Symmetry: D3
Subunit: 235 residues, 6 copies
């Protein structure tokens, strides 16, 4: 149907969970969905559609960086009539009070990208997570009683960032974590009158060395997944 | 104590309601607070401190525009140790589905200002309302059962905006309303590890002529005030 | 007549003196004008119209920051057909050769704001004081024989400026003082084919501790006021 | 060895061919290399190392967009000590004199991204292909006698570009094609004192409908691959 | 003494008149100065030093564009200890009320250049003519009773400007004329604690066809020269 | 024919060599061309047209800075129907591996100017030398067997650059040399479907003191000239 998707309108559920790693997306599909069917694998993106608690749900990769997720999100909202895209994955902690293996719910995401300035007449567009999605993620967290931190995230274009001072600046303004897609996703959802959200488990800290026990990193991941899945049902 | 405030540390409650109109702030103090005492009137700003349901509460004006509210907010968070600043006032609707006299709860605010870019190494800072404050405002709305719209707002530096195309662009991205302070307030709260939020009643629509009945504009205002006050207690 | 002014066309003199402090404006009206009448008090702005040496003159506050004064200036030039707006007030010295209590006449004002870039296709607009007004202010200074310094001013959006290096940069380029309105005012006057100017008394120095004797600060203020008033007559 | 690569120093050849599609990279490895061995598949990136005419050569995917390829390129140049990265893939034609199925050799790439401005003190960095690589690609083209167009390319962050006027502007300045990685790749090669280049086959035209015969699109692809491979040997 | 000047400290008068055309500068030297001596001709710049009414005066070309005059001005203020640089030349009218052959005195100059933003931490620097020089030029005009227009000028980097809408924008803000050096000159004078000014005769109008009689264009030029010369003496 | 050129269509050869120094251009004309005739001297620019090996060739100065060369290049390509403009001159070395008296062939040029951003919708335009011209210059170098370095150049607007850190940044990215015209020239050639190139001899190093023997600086210059001339014939 599109340059980056072979599936046809209807193959995708109206709620799609997206992560960077296509293998992760394949794992998710095989681990949490019932009767997952590969509906799209253009560029080995691993797009699946199965069910969770009787409801239709799709999981697909979105590469890394805003330019990438921007392609998938717009194609999904526009061509496949998707209504909700919840980004699920890992990220790097910034704030000193955030520890590795912590789950973070993005209220919004800042960015060093130029995309939003391009779509917003060079002004400051607040890449804000859909309020419904934020509430669904937080309610899920509360109901499952899984500690989660809610706040600003930051979508960087430079994983290896030359501006090393930026990190401390972000810690001063209390940015919770860093990833590479949210700031691009959120505004595209607004444009299509659709919804977007993001939940991540901190896989590493950028300001100091952390303690990462083998079974603690997985628990954290599974916990984030439960929240994302339950919230999807609520939506 | 400061160049723009004569009050001393302790004169202000830890939760402060701020609007642009100092006369409005005086009205609010005399109408909703018990035993309101004028603690600061430098520049006729009308800063009061009284009580609501037994709890300490302060109401003060903040002029118009980010540069203005930036002065008051930082002085309050820094010198008077205020913890929460809820901006309460009027605004101009953008989105076609938003009508005059509607109450809007800001999740965040975009801006055509350069301030946040100055404090954020020229990148995109997401002026986001403190999540606690957004939730307190929405819960108050729900509990009082007062219809309110939650979403992005826009803080403009140009009330009379030369870029007339911006309005339609904002309607396409579904910005709810336009005011002139939120985008400045939110990031200053983050810096001080404090909290900020904004709730406004739409006094006019920028894309078309609206119907404004005399008693409907006041009800709307009183309703917004109830929500702001109750939320303050919850915080 | 406007959203921020209740007065009608004709209530304002064609020459208006504006300062940030509305109480200051009230003081000015009661101290230097004959038969001052409050023609507008929307937002406690304290707008008066009286006479000086038989001629009509208006004094009104304009809040703090470019976004604020931008609203009043354009409304005045456009709706009330005002011809001259002279900003009168305080400011912070930059240049080492400028001392507290010194009177400064702005030839122009730089800014860290984005407004002029918005109205000027993102190029460098030189916020220049109307040449007639500069000459009227300087002639008044010379005739009254009151020492005044003439040069560049700087209108900041950040009273509390994160970019602490900016101050020394400005001292190197010899910016005389810092305030928060001129850069916005000047270009709006040009747009309306009208005139604008600014004169300030330095109330404090930003690069070092100064000596401020009680009666020296008032004399300085009264002197600045005489110059502003006489120049108004000349215009 | 890295967050996005499991291979160790030595697993990668000093010359690496990179395309967006990981499946394409797998195809390339199985079709043109002898004894290709999968040395890295983190994120299903499909990184292989085999031989071409007795020489070591690696082929791996790089996702879509500058942020993505920026991660891989820097990791490869820095950790795996790679010397040459030749981007090989598809692109969209701009210039009217460029037709679908045409092969284009990038001399350089423009971009609407902010990355290079971030690494270059906000000035204009000319994302230029390593001269050795450009010459190797052009010599290969000449020796194989395969018609190829040499000129500027454009790396966009927005596949779906809101600024629809940009296309005609680029046609006026004769930008040959559009892709999404070159502008990020080239400067990273310079930083590491290494080399980078890009060759693409136009899979579609952005200014008008083109004729794409089944066997013409493959020939074009195979031809581009021959040039890329032979040039690699020359390097 | 410098890369662009062979003269030594002392060869140049403390007041230097500069125009773009080196031949014009040679003409000026031979026509208005007594005993003009060529003190520098690096790059055929035609730098002379002679006398006017017994006082030392130098005339030299400065090429075209800010980058050019920036080199000469800084070298002159820094190495040759020059105190005043008055730019004298031609320009293109913008404002409809400005006619060909009109003399214009710059109060300041706007620009589409990035230089001042580079030297001013990316903020708005008001390229303002030294107030002493503006007054000297205007007094000379008044004393000689030669009609002159005083106001903003604009220094463009693009004589052939792609942004054709800019012209009308400038006419709306009443920019008097367009040249290519003032915006660069003025800030360099400030940096060296020295002085700069600019006076031009409009040789053509950019918004419509004008009437240019043979002897009217010369008179205008001679008149501008008298003003520049007399003002130099006053300084 | 134009404001800066008195010559008529046909007076200029289709290939024009341009340097900053008009005296240098005069020298070149008298030293390397047969029967050189001065076809244009507006502003003492020294524009000549003679022959080299029987072929028509023109040499003319272009002042200093992008704004300057932009005027000449566009007038030449547009009015005089010139096809190739090869900038020939001096420059300042950046990279530590570049020594004084070294000849450098620009593949492209970066810049701190705003021109290209103005003509390119505020995006990154890669000021790239025409590939034909680069190849002609390099072939000439190879055939004459004159060592030349090929790579990025940088066209600065600030000969005296306040941003002293830029130099080291450029050395890290391996910018070969610095001049003041290429970045402006290259894009104008693209616009006119014409060609441009640049070759310079390093007259000084910006990062350290160099050894410059009298006869080594001239040899270097003559060598650069041979390459430029021979390449012109090849084109």
């Amino acid at each position: 149907a599109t340059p980056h998707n072979s599936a046809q309108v209807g193959d995708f559920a109206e709620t799609v969970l997206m992560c960077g790693d296509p293998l992760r997306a394949k794992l998710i599909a095989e681990t949490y969905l019932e009767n997952p069917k590969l509906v799209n694998n253009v560029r080995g993106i691993q797009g699946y559609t199965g069910t969770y608690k009787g409801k239709p749900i799709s999981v697909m990769g979105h590469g890394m960086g805003l330019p990438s997720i921007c392609i998938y999100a717009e194609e999904l909202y526009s061509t496949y009539k998707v209504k909700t895209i919840i980004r699920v994955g890992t990220c790097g902690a910034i704030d000193m009070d955030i520890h590795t293996r912590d789950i973070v719910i993005f209220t919004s995401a800042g960015t060093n990208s130029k995309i939003n300035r391009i779509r917003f007449m060079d002004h400051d567009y607040p890449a804000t997570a859909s309020f419904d999605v934020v509430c669904a993620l937080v309610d899920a967290a509360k109901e499952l009683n899984i500690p989660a931190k809610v706040g600003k995230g930051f979508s960087t274009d430079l994983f290896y960032n030359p501006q090393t001072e930026l990190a401390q600046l972000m810690n001063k303004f209390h940015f919770l974590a860093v990833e590479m897609e949210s700031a691009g996703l959120f505004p595209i959802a607004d444009l299509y009158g659709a919804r977007a959200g993001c939940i991540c488990t901190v896989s590493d800290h950028i300001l100091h060395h952390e303690e990462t026990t083998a079974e603690e990193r997985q628990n954290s991941f599974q916990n984030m997944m439960k929240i994302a899945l339950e919230a999807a049902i609520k939506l």
